Design a protein around this ligand. Structure first.
Ligand SMILES: Cc1nc2cnc(Nc3ccnc(NCC(C)(C)C(N)=O)n3)cc2n1C(C)C
Length: 300
Protein backbone atom coordinates (compact mmCIF):
# COMPACT_ATOMS: atom_id res chain seq x y z
CA UNK A 1 0.00 0.00 0.00
CA UNK A 2 0.84 3.79 0.20
CA UNK A 3 4.27 4.95 1.58
CA UNK A 4 4.12 6.74 4.97
CA UNK A 5 5.96 10.02 4.27
CA UNK A 6 5.28 11.42 7.80
CA UNK A 7 8.16 13.37 9.41
CA UNK A 8 9.62 12.15 12.70
CA UNK A 9 10.90 15.33 14.37
CA UNK A 10 13.85 14.90 16.78
CA UNK A 11 13.82 17.65 19.45
CA UNK A 12 16.82 18.77 21.56
CA UNK A 13 16.43 18.47 25.40
CA UNK A 14 17.54 22.18 25.63
CA UNK A 15 14.64 23.31 23.27
CA UNK A 16 11.98 22.54 25.93
CA UNK A 17 11.37 22.84 29.72
CA UNK A 18 9.38 20.62 32.19
CA UNK A 19 7.15 22.76 34.43
CA UNK A 20 5.16 20.26 36.60
CA UNK A 21 3.73 16.69 36.67
CA UNK A 22 0.23 16.34 35.13
CA UNK A 23 -0.27 12.65 35.90
CA UNK A 24 1.35 9.28 36.66
CA UNK A 25 -0.03 5.81 35.86
CA UNK A 26 0.31 2.61 33.76
CA UNK A 27 1.52 4.70 30.74
CA UNK A 28 4.34 6.36 32.74
CA UNK A 29 4.53 10.03 33.74
CA UNK A 30 3.18 13.06 31.78
CA UNK A 31 4.62 16.56 32.40
CA UNK A 32 3.30 20.05 31.66
CA UNK A 33 5.95 21.79 29.54
CA UNK A 34 7.01 24.56 27.18
CA UNK A 35 8.79 24.22 23.83
CA UNK A 36 10.85 27.20 22.49
CA UNK A 37 12.15 26.02 19.03
CA UNK A 38 15.52 27.30 17.62
CA UNK A 39 15.27 31.08 16.97
CA UNK A 40 11.55 31.06 16.10
CA UNK A 41 10.43 33.50 18.89
CA UNK A 42 7.53 31.11 19.92
CA UNK A 43 6.53 29.22 23.13
CA UNK A 44 4.44 26.07 22.53
CA UNK A 45 2.52 24.59 25.54
CA UNK A 46 3.45 20.89 25.47
CA UNK A 47 2.80 17.59 27.28
CA UNK A 48 5.93 15.43 27.77
CA UNK A 49 5.32 11.65 28.18
CA UNK A 50 8.30 9.60 29.54
CA UNK A 51 8.70 5.86 30.47
CA UNK A 52 14.13 2.22 34.19
CA UNK A 53 15.58 2.18 30.63
CA UNK A 54 14.84 -1.20 29.02
CA UNK A 55 15.05 -2.13 25.26
CA UNK A 56 11.42 -3.48 25.27
CA UNK A 57 9.88 -0.28 26.80
CA UNK A 58 11.78 1.90 24.25
CA UNK A 59 10.40 -0.26 21.38
CA UNK A 60 6.80 0.15 22.68
CA UNK A 61 7.10 3.95 23.04
CA UNK A 62 8.70 4.21 19.53
CA UNK A 63 5.84 2.04 18.18
CA UNK A 64 3.40 4.62 19.62
CA UNK A 65 5.58 7.52 18.29
CA UNK A 66 5.33 6.01 14.75
CA UNK A 67 1.47 5.91 14.83
CA UNK A 68 1.14 9.35 16.57
CA UNK A 69 3.45 11.07 14.00
CA UNK A 70 1.41 9.47 11.14
CA UNK A 71 -1.89 11.22 12.05
CA UNK A 72 -3.14 14.73 11.13
CA UNK A 73 -6.77 15.58 11.98
CA UNK A 74 -8.39 18.29 14.20
CA UNK A 75 -9.93 15.56 16.43
CA UNK A 76 -6.82 13.31 16.79
CA UNK A 77 -3.70 13.89 18.97
CA UNK A 78 -0.57 14.25 16.79
CA UNK A 79 3.05 13.70 17.95
CA UNK A 80 4.98 17.02 17.80
CA UNK A 81 8.31 15.21 18.16
CA UNK A 82 10.56 12.91 20.22
CA UNK A 83 13.58 13.64 22.41
CA UNK A 84 16.36 11.02 22.26
CA UNK A 85 17.51 11.03 25.89
CA UNK A 86 18.54 7.91 27.88
CA UNK A 87 14.85 7.84 29.02
CA UNK A 88 13.37 8.77 25.50
CA UNK A 89 10.24 10.99 25.69
CA UNK A 90 7.23 11.87 23.48
CA UNK A 91 6.44 15.57 23.00
CA UNK A 92 2.71 16.08 22.46
CA UNK A 93 0.22 18.98 22.49
CA UNK A 94 -0.94 20.31 25.91
CA UNK A 95 -4.68 19.53 26.36
CA UNK A 96 -5.10 21.81 29.43
CA UNK A 97 -8.45 20.39 30.62
CA UNK A 98 -7.15 16.76 30.77
CA UNK A 99 -9.26 13.70 29.89
CA UNK A 100 -12.98 13.89 29.05
CA UNK A 101 -13.77 11.20 31.67
CA UNK A 102 -12.44 13.32 34.58
CA UNK A 103 -13.92 16.45 32.91
CA UNK A 104 -17.55 15.11 32.83
CA UNK A 105 -17.17 13.88 36.45
CA UNK A 106 -15.80 17.26 37.71
CA UNK A 107 -18.12 19.53 35.65
CA UNK A 108 -21.50 17.60 35.37
CA UNK A 109 -23.40 20.66 36.81
CA UNK A 110 -22.25 22.90 33.88
CA UNK A 111 -22.33 20.30 31.07
CA UNK A 112 -25.33 20.70 28.76
CA UNK A 113 -26.82 18.75 25.81
CA UNK A 114 -25.02 20.89 23.15
CA UNK A 115 -21.61 19.99 24.64
CA UNK A 116 -22.29 16.22 24.98
CA UNK A 117 -23.68 15.91 21.43
CA UNK A 118 -20.83 18.05 19.97
CA UNK A 119 -18.25 15.78 21.73
CA UNK A 120 -19.98 12.74 20.16
CA UNK A 121 -19.71 14.41 16.68
CA UNK A 122 -16.00 15.21 17.31
CA UNK A 123 -15.11 11.67 18.51
CA UNK A 124 -16.96 10.19 15.48
CA UNK A 125 -14.94 12.55 13.15
CA UNK A 126 -11.57 11.56 14.65
CA UNK A 127 -12.59 7.90 14.52
CA UNK A 128 -13.77 8.21 10.88
CA UNK A 129 -10.34 9.79 10.12
CA UNK A 130 -8.52 6.84 11.78
CA UNK A 131 -10.66 4.53 9.56
CA UNK A 132 -9.68 6.55 6.41
CA UNK A 133 -6.02 6.11 7.45
CA UNK A 134 -6.84 2.33 7.92
CA UNK A 135 -5.95 2.54 11.65
CA UNK A 136 -7.81 0.42 14.26
CA UNK A 137 -7.61 2.21 17.67
CA UNK A 138 -8.23 -0.89 19.95
CA UNK A 139 -8.44 1.35 23.11
CA UNK A 140 -11.19 3.96 22.58
CA UNK A 141 -12.62 5.17 25.94
CA UNK A 142 -13.57 8.54 27.55
CA UNK A 143 -10.14 8.34 29.35
CA UNK A 144 -8.45 8.42 25.88
CA UNK A 145 -10.34 11.53 24.67
CA UNK A 146 -8.56 14.73 25.78
CA UNK A 147 -9.96 18.25 26.15
CA UNK A 148 -8.05 21.13 24.40
CA UNK A 149 -10.93 23.56 25.27
CA UNK A 150 -14.41 22.52 26.64
CA UNK A 151 -15.65 22.93 23.00
CA UNK A 152 -12.76 20.99 21.36
CA UNK A 153 -11.85 17.35 22.17
CA UNK A 154 -9.33 14.94 20.49
CA UNK A 155 -8.71 11.15 20.49
CA UNK A 156 -5.37 9.92 21.96
CA UNK A 157 -3.42 6.77 23.15
CA UNK A 158 -2.02 4.89 20.13
CA UNK A 159 -0.23 2.28 22.30
CA UNK A 160 -2.69 -0.36 20.98
CA UNK A 161 -3.38 1.20 17.49
CA UNK A 162 -2.65 -1.43 14.77
CA UNK A 163 -6.89 -5.40 27.89
CA UNK A 164 -9.98 -3.10 28.32
CA UNK A 165 -12.73 -5.82 28.39
CA UNK A 166 -15.60 -3.45 29.41
CA UNK A 167 -14.98 -1.33 26.23
CA UNK A 168 -14.38 -4.29 23.87
CA UNK A 169 -16.64 -5.83 21.22
CA UNK A 170 -17.71 -9.48 21.85
CA UNK A 171 -15.51 -10.77 18.90
CA UNK A 172 -12.49 -9.02 20.49
CA UNK A 173 -13.01 -10.68 23.94
CA UNK A 174 -13.74 -14.16 22.51
CA UNK A 175 -11.58 -14.30 19.34
CA UNK A 176 -9.19 -11.27 19.60
CA UNK A 177 -10.74 -9.86 16.34
CA UNK A 178 -10.32 -6.06 16.02
CA UNK A 179 -11.90 -4.08 13.18
CA UNK A 180 -13.16 -0.48 12.69
CA UNK A 181 -16.57 -1.96 13.62
CA UNK A 182 -15.07 -3.17 16.93
CA UNK A 183 -13.95 0.50 17.48
CA UNK A 184 -17.68 1.40 16.97
CA UNK A 185 -18.52 -0.83 20.02
CA UNK A 186 -15.91 1.12 22.09
CA UNK A 187 -17.49 4.33 20.69
CA UNK A 188 -20.93 3.31 22.07
CA UNK A 189 -19.36 2.65 25.53
CA UNK A 190 -17.51 6.05 25.36
CA UNK A 191 -20.88 7.77 24.58
CA UNK A 192 -22.43 5.90 27.56
CA UNK A 193 -19.57 7.18 29.80
CA UNK A 194 -20.34 10.78 28.72
CA UNK A 195 -24.16 10.48 29.00
CA UNK A 196 -23.80 9.13 32.59
CA UNK A 197 -21.29 11.94 33.48
CA UNK A 198 -18.41 9.47 33.91
CA UNK A 199 -20.00 6.31 35.34
CA UNK A 200 -17.91 3.09 35.47
CA UNK A 201 -19.40 0.59 32.90
CA UNK A 202 -20.69 -2.64 34.55
CA UNK A 203 -19.58 -1.31 37.99
CA UNK A 204 -18.92 -4.07 40.55
CA UNK A 205 -19.18 -6.80 37.86
CA UNK A 206 -15.84 -8.71 37.41
CA UNK A 207 -14.25 -8.56 33.89
CA UNK A 208 -14.49 -12.41 33.61
CA UNK A 209 -18.35 -12.18 33.76
CA UNK A 210 -18.62 -9.61 30.84
CA UNK A 211 -18.22 -12.19 27.98
CA UNK A 212 -21.19 -14.29 29.34
CA UNK A 213 -23.30 -11.16 30.15
CA UNK A 214 -23.03 -9.84 26.52
CA UNK A 215 -23.66 -13.34 25.02
CA UNK A 216 -27.01 -13.53 26.96
CA UNK A 217 -28.11 -10.17 25.50
CA UNK A 218 -27.38 -7.82 28.46
CA UNK A 219 -26.12 -4.30 27.59
CA UNK A 220 -25.32 -1.01 29.42
CA UNK A 221 -28.51 0.68 30.78
CA UNK A 222 -30.29 3.73 29.31
CA UNK A 223 -28.76 6.86 31.00
CA UNK A 224 -31.49 9.10 32.61
CA UNK A 225 -30.68 12.08 30.31
CA UNK A 226 -30.98 9.84 27.18
CA UNK A 227 -34.00 9.82 24.93
CA UNK A 228 -34.74 6.53 23.08
CA UNK A 229 -33.19 8.31 19.97
CA UNK A 230 -29.67 8.56 21.56
CA UNK A 231 -29.88 5.15 23.39
CA UNK A 232 -30.94 3.41 20.11
CA UNK A 233 -27.63 4.67 18.59
CA UNK A 234 -25.67 3.31 21.63
CA UNK A 235 -27.49 -0.06 21.36
CA UNK A 236 -26.78 -0.24 17.55
CA UNK A 237 -23.00 0.04 18.37
CA UNK A 238 -23.40 -3.08 20.59
CA UNK A 239 -24.93 -5.56 18.10
CA UNK A 240 -23.45 -9.11 17.79
CA UNK A 241 -23.09 -8.63 13.98
CA UNK A 242 -20.29 -6.04 13.43
CA UNK A 243 -21.67 -5.11 9.95
CA UNK A 244 -25.05 -4.28 11.57
CA UNK A 245 -23.32 -1.65 13.79
CA UNK A 246 -23.31 1.97 12.46
CA UNK A 247 -20.33 3.32 10.49
CA UNK A 248 -18.44 6.31 11.99
CA UNK A 249 -19.52 8.47 9.00
CA UNK A 250 -23.21 7.71 9.91
CA UNK A 251 -22.47 8.53 13.60
CA UNK A 252 -21.15 12.00 12.56
CA UNK A 253 -24.43 12.51 10.59
CA UNK A 254 -26.70 11.16 13.40
CA UNK A 255 -25.15 13.18 16.24
CA UNK A 256 -24.88 16.35 14.03
CA UNK A 257 -28.64 16.28 13.27
CA UNK A 258 -29.20 15.97 17.04
CA UNK A 259 -26.66 18.70 17.89
CA UNK A 260 -28.89 21.14 15.84
CA UNK A 261 -31.70 20.69 18.44
CA UNK A 262 -29.97 19.24 21.56
CA UNK A 263 -32.92 19.56 24.05
CA UNK A 264 -35.02 17.20 21.84
CA UNK A 265 -32.40 14.43 22.33
CA UNK A 266 -30.99 14.98 25.87
CA UNK A 267 -33.02 15.96 28.94
CA UNK A 268 -30.79 17.78 31.49
CA UNK A 269 -32.30 19.99 34.26
CA UNK A 270 -30.73 23.45 34.10
CA UNK A 271 -29.67 23.12 30.40
CA UNK A 272 -28.72 26.28 28.33
CA UNK A 273 -28.23 28.28 31.62
CA UNK A 274 -25.07 26.13 32.12
CA UNK A 275 -21.72 27.51 30.86
CA UNK A 276 -18.12 26.19 30.65
CA UNK A 277 -14.81 28.18 30.03
CA UNK A 278 -14.23 29.60 26.49
CA UNK A 279 -11.43 31.60 24.68
CA UNK A 280 -13.98 34.50 25.18
CA UNK A 281 -13.45 34.23 29.04
CA UNK A 282 -11.30 36.46 31.28
CA UNK A 283 -7.84 34.87 31.87
CA UNK A 284 -8.82 31.63 29.98
CA UNK A 285 -5.25 31.34 28.55
CA UNK A 286 2.33 31.51 34.47
CA UNK A 287 5.70 32.95 33.25
CA UNK A 288 5.69 35.02 29.99
CA UNK A 289 2.42 34.72 28.04
CA UNK A 290 3.96 36.99 25.33
CA UNK A 291 5.00 34.66 22.45
CA UNK A 292 2.88 31.57 23.26
CA UNK A 293 1.15 29.84 20.28
CA UNK A 294 -0.85 26.62 20.41
CA UNK A 295 0.65 23.58 18.58
CA UNK A 296 -2.35 23.61 16.16
CA UNK A 297 -1.07 27.01 14.86
CA UNK A 298 2.65 26.06 14.93
CA UNK A 299 3.33 24.39 11.55
CA UNK A 300 6.87 24.08 10.08
C1 LIG B 1 -4.21 15.76 33.52
C2 LIG B 1 -3.67 15.93 32.12
N1 LIG B 1 -3.45 17.10 31.59
C3 LIG B 1 -2.97 16.95 30.33
C4 LIG B 1 -2.56 17.85 29.34
N2 LIG B 1 -2.13 17.41 28.17
C5 LIG B 1 -2.03 16.11 27.87
N3 LIG B 1 -1.52 15.83 26.59
C6 LIG B 1 -1.54 14.63 25.89
C7 LIG B 1 -1.57 14.65 24.48
C8 LIG B 1 -1.58 13.43 23.81
N4 LIG B 1 -1.54 12.30 24.52
C9 LIG B 1 -1.52 12.31 25.85
N5 LIG B 1 -1.44 11.13 26.57
C10 LIG B 1 -2.61 10.55 27.24
C11 LIG B 1 -2.28 9.23 27.97
C12 LIG B 1 -1.32 8.37 27.14
C13 LIG B 1 -1.62 9.59 29.30
C14 LIG B 1 -3.57 8.47 28.27
N6 LIG B 1 -3.61 7.12 28.21
O1 LIG B 1 -4.58 9.06 28.60
N7 LIG B 1 -1.49 13.45 26.52
C15 LIG B 1 -2.39 15.14 28.82
C16 LIG B 1 -2.88 15.55 30.07
N8 LIG B 1 -3.35 14.93 31.23
C17 LIG B 1 -3.45 13.48 31.52
C18 LIG B 1 -4.30 12.71 30.51
C19 LIG B 1 -2.07 12.84 31.73
Amino acid sequence: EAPNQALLRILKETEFKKIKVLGSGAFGTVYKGLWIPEGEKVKIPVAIKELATSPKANKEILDEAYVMASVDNPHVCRLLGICLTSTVQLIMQLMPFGCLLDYVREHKDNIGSQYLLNWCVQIAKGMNYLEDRRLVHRDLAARNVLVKTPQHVKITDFGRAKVPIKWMALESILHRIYTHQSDVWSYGVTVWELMTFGSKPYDGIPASEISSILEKGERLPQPPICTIDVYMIMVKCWMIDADSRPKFRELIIEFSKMARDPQRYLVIQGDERMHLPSPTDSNFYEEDMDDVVDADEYLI
